[PDB]
């Protein structure tokens, strides 16, 4: 661990200030733990090999002098050549961010060059010296505090890795300013190639050194747990969905935590564990930090697959790692199963003949549960390539190794171009390194992993009665109908708040259902805070939509449940009437239910705040039997009949003002747009977008030409930077954006988002997120700056959850297939009409403009139906004139008709058509931009595309006009 610490602190944090005393400053900061000579050499080799794809910049072409771009101008003009002040480029988009605050606080001088034998620079030198000394003092203070806090090398290293950046930022905020600290914590590791911060390079160096220590060969490992989508798909209530997501997240986190504990937290590239709420929870459970975010721990953040780079000695170590991962996961699941069995199965049931008959079937059920999931650990061993001899000889040898494998033409060509550009640097130390092939090693791993996910290897079960949820696993007692029926009735009677009488569960479904009752008792989440959310029915989300007065029905129901107060007092007497009616109905039901003592008394006692929000719906209160069923308790009372009449009259006044409780909601699932393509390098730009400012000018013509064309590949530091950006988007931005939209976030893992929203604010949020995923620099915080594909569904609260999830997944897949970078909006009413359309994100604005025009009654809402009728006989030659005539005829004239026509033209332009044949070419142009008009002009069909474009644009206009 001490070696790990030295490797991590191999560079000074202010390395970009004055490179002359970099090593001395780093040694002073390290102090007593300063590395020895051999350790210094090893760490130097690792740092050289870390991001070597851009660490070979020794192009002393301008007057045969090496370039430099540090903040200091005292560097000798003979050996060194000054180029400017450091900046930062985005690791993907290459967006450039300046350094205004630090330059402003920097020693103010007018001499651009301040050579060692120059004039008017002594004051500048003094200011530089004092600034550097103060910064070094702050860094030393922070590091010394961390060293004093912890004693064990491992724990100290872990705590440093977790919180050194934040502690230093907090200390340096008071140094000059908060902006000074914010700009300072993001200094690039190397000024020549500033595609990442210093800390990312430091982490990559630490990981590489850890892998290479003691002669252990490096090897990449990708771990994936499948199947997934089916597991989430089968659910009934929102609590089941949350439980499934949390279960998968904890299952992945078990393996991730085991790997981190075995070697170190930095060995995991993606997901970026730094700042993950589960990571903070594990730190708290490790008795290292007191951090525990209860609200954050609710969300499922850990994705379902993880990548790591570890050093090993032999394949036996790989087998031992597989065994350890499997043992950890299986032990966790087994203890969960035992908790459910002892707490629930033996709880409600007794020593009756059912338990004796069950007996050994518990073993079969447990084995069924344990073997349900498949874990794949695909490992690709790194292959050291001989780079000894001349630089040209080493480059030739590595190229031969690349070509010897045998690969399709495109991959070989792109990697050979990358290798040639890398070797183009004119120096005696341009010998390539193994990690320059990193981008290859990763990609070949991924494909391999997919194959290793095919095999199932499931157990065998006897005949019996299945489970109503899955339908493929034998329930707990299925050999005979009577035992199934009586045991499930008994367990339902014991816990009426979890399942109904007509419900038979397999082991998996039972564990999933009772997960909310076991999670707070789990060793990981104990002492952290609230884990489960409060929303138990999606009708709550439907009622979360803003009303006309602004008092959404969630607050109104909250007062009835006795959980929250109500700000408005216009219908306070109505609130008392509803509360009295609810209390009287609950008390009357409590007398009858307790009379037979069928349901547990605890449920009846908690029914004061556990009354379902469906009672707030007027239609559910048609009859006493309907109200009893809505409450949940099975019907199988003249006074209660009068009570229902009084409650219905009381609720009538409330519904007359704030309206009926909305019964519709939106499900939104967003996925990344095939990040594998960008990781392979098929989406990256040329290396010119990743130089410092204009270094291509101060270099040889051949190197400039090569860097002008060859697309940059990916180094481990760049990969860590991308992963941290993804973490920043997923953790620090999505929950806040959703809370702005008054929605509910279920599972936000990496680039996957799943949310349930009120219909009133969905299309706005779906737009805003699409912007956040495309921003490259949100202030001083990085963001992915990529594209994503969305799927949105609007449904009433009656359809089954499984069908809704399946339909939403299908919509997302269709949007992805049609060309990505789009959203497949879809409305399904209770009747059965399913209006779907795939559109770009900008077209939502055109639809919003048209809907606002219609709601304001500036244009009559009758043009829509005429246009829909005329769509099937509409061509390009007629459509503009027909639309203009119809807008003139069916509006109040003025500029409103022209504005409506223009907005309609734009909206119809922005629609993804789904024809037969060469739809890939047309859809790509449609997502491209203005090329859609030109390509469609020369298109073969050129008519059916228009016929479908207008029909799609009218469909979601109809959807939006509803709300």
């Amino acid at each position: 661990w001490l070696n790990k610490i030295r490797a991590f602190f191999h560079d000074p944090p202010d390395k970009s200030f004055e490179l002359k005393t970099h090593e001395r400053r780093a040694s002073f900061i390290l102090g007593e733990l300063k590395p020895s000579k051999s350790l210094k050499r090893i760490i130097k080799n690792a740092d050289i090999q870390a991001s070597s794809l851009q660490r070979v910049d020794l192009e002393k072409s301008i007057h045969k002098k090496e370039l430099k771009s540090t903040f200091d101008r005292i560097h000798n003009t003979e050996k060194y050549e000054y180029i400017g002040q450091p900046i930062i480029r985005h690791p993907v988009t290459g967006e450039i961010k300046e350094y205004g605050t630090i330059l402003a606080n920097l020693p103010q001088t007018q001499r651009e060059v301040y050579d060692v034998d120059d004039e008017g620079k002594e004051d500048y030198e003094e200011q530089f010296q004092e600034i550097l000394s103060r910064i070094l003092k702050i860094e030393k203070k922070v590091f010394d505090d961390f060293k004093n806090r912890y004693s064990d090398p491992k724990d100290l290293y872990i705590s440093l890795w977790a919180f050194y950046a934040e502690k230093l930022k907090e200390a340096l905020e008071e140094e000059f300013s908060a902006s000074f600290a914010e700009e300072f914590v993001n200094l690039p590791a190397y000024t020549l190639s500033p595609d990442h911060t210093l800390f990312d390079h430091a982490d990559a160096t630490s990981a590489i050194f850890g892998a290479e220590i003691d002669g252990k060969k490096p090897v990449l490992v990708l771990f994936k747990i499948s199947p997934v989508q089916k597991f989430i798909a089968d659910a009934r209530k929102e609590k089941d969905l949350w439980a499934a997501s949390h279960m998968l997240s904890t299952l992945t986190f078990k393996a991730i935590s085991f790997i981190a504990d075995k070697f170190g937290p930095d060995v995991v590239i993606y997901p970026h564990l730094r700042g993950n709420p589960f990571f903070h929870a594990w730190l708290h459970s490790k008795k290292i930090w007191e951090f525990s975010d209860s609200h954050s721990l609710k969300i499922a953040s850990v994705p379902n697959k993880f990548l790591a780079l570890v050093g090993v000695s032999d394949e036996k170590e790989l087998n031992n790692l597989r065994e350890g991962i499997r043992n950890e996961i299986e032990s966790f699941l087994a203890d969960l199963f035992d908790k459910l069995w002892n707490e629930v199965i033996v709880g409600a049931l007794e020593h009756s003949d059912a338990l004796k008959h069950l007996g050994d079937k518990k073993e079969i059920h447990k084995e069924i549960l344990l073997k349900r999931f498949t874990l794949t650990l695909s490992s690709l061993k790194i292959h050291d390539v001989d780079v000894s001899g001349s630089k040209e000889e080493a480059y030739e040898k590595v190229k031969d190794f690349v070509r010897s494998l045998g690969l399709p033409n495109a991959i070989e060509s792109k990697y050979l171009q990358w290798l040639d550009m890398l070797g183009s640097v004119e120096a005696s130390n341009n010998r390539p390194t193994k990690y320059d092939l990193y981008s290859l090693y990763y990609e070949i791993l991924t494909v391999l992993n997919a194959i290793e996910s095919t095999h199932f290897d499931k157990p065998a079960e006897p005949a019996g009665y299945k489970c109503t949820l899955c339908g493929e696993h034998l329930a707990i007692g299925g050999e005979s109908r009577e035992m199934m029926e009586n045991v499930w009735g008994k367990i339902h009677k014991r816990w009426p708040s979890h399942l109904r009488s007509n419900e038979r569960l397999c082991a998996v479904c039972a564990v999933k259902r009772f997960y909310p009752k076991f999670i707070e008792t789990l060793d990981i989440f104990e002492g952290v805070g609230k884990v489960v959310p409060d929303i138990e029915s999606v009708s709550e989300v439907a009622m979360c939509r803003r009303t006309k007065h602004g008092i959404t029905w969630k607050e109104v129901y909250d007062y009835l449940r006795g959980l929250k107060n109500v700000d408005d007092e216009k219908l306070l007497g109505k609130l008392e009437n509803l509360k009295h009616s609810v209390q009287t109905l609950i008390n009357n039901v409590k007398s009858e239910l307790k009379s037979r003592k069928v349901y547990p008394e605890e449920f009846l006692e908690g029914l004061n705040r556990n009354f379902s929000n469906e009672i707030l719906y007027s239609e559910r209160l048609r009859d006493f039997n309907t109200l009893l069923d809505t409450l949940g308790f099975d019907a199988a009372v003249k006074n209660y009949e009068t009570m229902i009449s009084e409650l219905r009259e009381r609720l009538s006044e409330v519904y007359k003002m704030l309206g009926e409780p909305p019964k519709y909601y939106a499900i939104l699932m967003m996925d990344g747009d095939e990040m594998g393509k960008l990781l392979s390098g098929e989406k990256l730009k040329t290396a010119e977008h990743y130089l410092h400012s204009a270094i291509l000018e101060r270099v040889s013509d051949a190197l400039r030409v090569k860097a002008k064309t060859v697309r940059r590949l990916i180094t481990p530091a760049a990969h860590s930077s991308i992963s941290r950006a993804l973490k920043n988007f997923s953790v620090n931005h999505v929950p806040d954006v959703v809370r702005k939209g008054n929605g509910t976030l279920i599972y936000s893992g990496g680039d996957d988002v799943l949310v349930l929203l009120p219909v009133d604010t969905a299309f706005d949020v779906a737009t805003e997120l699409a912007m956040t995923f495309s921003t490259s620099w949100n202030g001083w915080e990085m963001l992915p700056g990529n594209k994503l594909s969305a799927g949105l569904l609007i449904v009433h609260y009656k359809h089954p959850l499984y069908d809704a999830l399946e339909k939403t997944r299908e919509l997302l897949q269709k949007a992805k297939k049609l060309g990505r970078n789009a959203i497949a909006v879809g409305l399904l009413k209770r009747s059965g009409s399913y209006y779907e359309s795939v559109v770009n994100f900008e077209t939502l604005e055109d639809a919003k403009a048209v809907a606002n025009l219609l709601v304001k009654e500036q244009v009559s809402p009758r043009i829509i139906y005429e246009l829909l009728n005329f769509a099937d006989v509409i061509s390009k030659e007629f459509l503009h004139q027909l639309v203009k005539y119809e807008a003139v005829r069916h509006s109040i004239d003025k500029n409103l008709a022209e504005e409506f026509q223009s907005v309609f033209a734009r909206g119809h332009q922005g629609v993804r058509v789904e024809l037969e044949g060469n739809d890939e070419e047309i859809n790509k142009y449609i997502s491209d931009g203005a090329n859609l008009e030109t390509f469609l002009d020369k298109y073969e069909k050129a008519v059916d595309v228009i016929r479908k474009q207008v029909r799609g644009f009218l469909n979601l206009v109809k959807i939006l006009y509803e709300s």
């Binding site: 061993k381 391999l448 696993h473």
Partner: protein, 341 residues
Amino acid sequence: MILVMKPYDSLLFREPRPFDVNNHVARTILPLPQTLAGAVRSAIYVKYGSKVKDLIGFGKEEPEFEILGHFFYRYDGKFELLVESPHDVTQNLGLVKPHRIDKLGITILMDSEGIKFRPFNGFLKFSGLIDYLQGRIAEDSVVERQKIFKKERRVGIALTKAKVTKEEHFYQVEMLRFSDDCGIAVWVEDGVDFDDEGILGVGGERRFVKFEKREEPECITNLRSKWKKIRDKINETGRLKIYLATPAILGAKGYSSKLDYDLLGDIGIERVRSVNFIGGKPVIFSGWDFVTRKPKPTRYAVPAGSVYFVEFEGEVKLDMPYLKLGKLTKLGYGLCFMGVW
């Protein structure tokens, strides 16, 4: 012999989801071989009474008469037979072969035009099956799924006494609407006694067909004739390919996809150098035993169209262009053609 089974209307081979009072929805899947096997067994048993109980295998999980497999068919100018599209064919109708790079110690199964590919959904004409087994997939030998059948949806409601909707009496189902002149065809071993014409009720919801017994077509005889050439080519190359035409239960005690070499040894292969299995999602299925009137044990089966790439030392000694695999073979499972890769 084959049994051309033209359906009168849509059919429903229900998924294993329970038809609970609250869970009143249903979905159809592609027809499993065991359903057709049960239908034929019942059709023979009922006509000839209890005297044929042994032949039908009453009570037992397997009969005595042999059912090879089931293909789809259509009447596009000629009686054409179609099988499932193998998973090794790309959308560009390009084959996929392993390219194991021993330098890096990997066995990547990347295609010939990249390391990423998606399987071609559709059906392969039985006429082109020989060419596919020889690795010469044509361009007109495949058709898509939607040209044969499209799924349709239906709703149903049980009325109360007079005219209103009875409580808990709503359901919605989904069935297979075969196109015109496009039905199923069951392949039965020769020598089993069966009536010529008539009707047969296959699948749930009591739907029937117009089954008619016919002799084998020319395609199967051509494949059988060229099997010797295929076999000697495989022996020369040493790289044998196995393609599955029906789901298989190849797993040992405890279902699994690990193709055990013991079954392979019976075909004449001495030493199996390597096995490269490409497939898809497993198929979970369980039937409804009539004798006990109870659901059968659940079984996981390798999906149809999975391909096994095997390099072997020795000689294939089979005189037939196909080989049975796994258990429940008589019902029509585990039908696998063998070709050269």
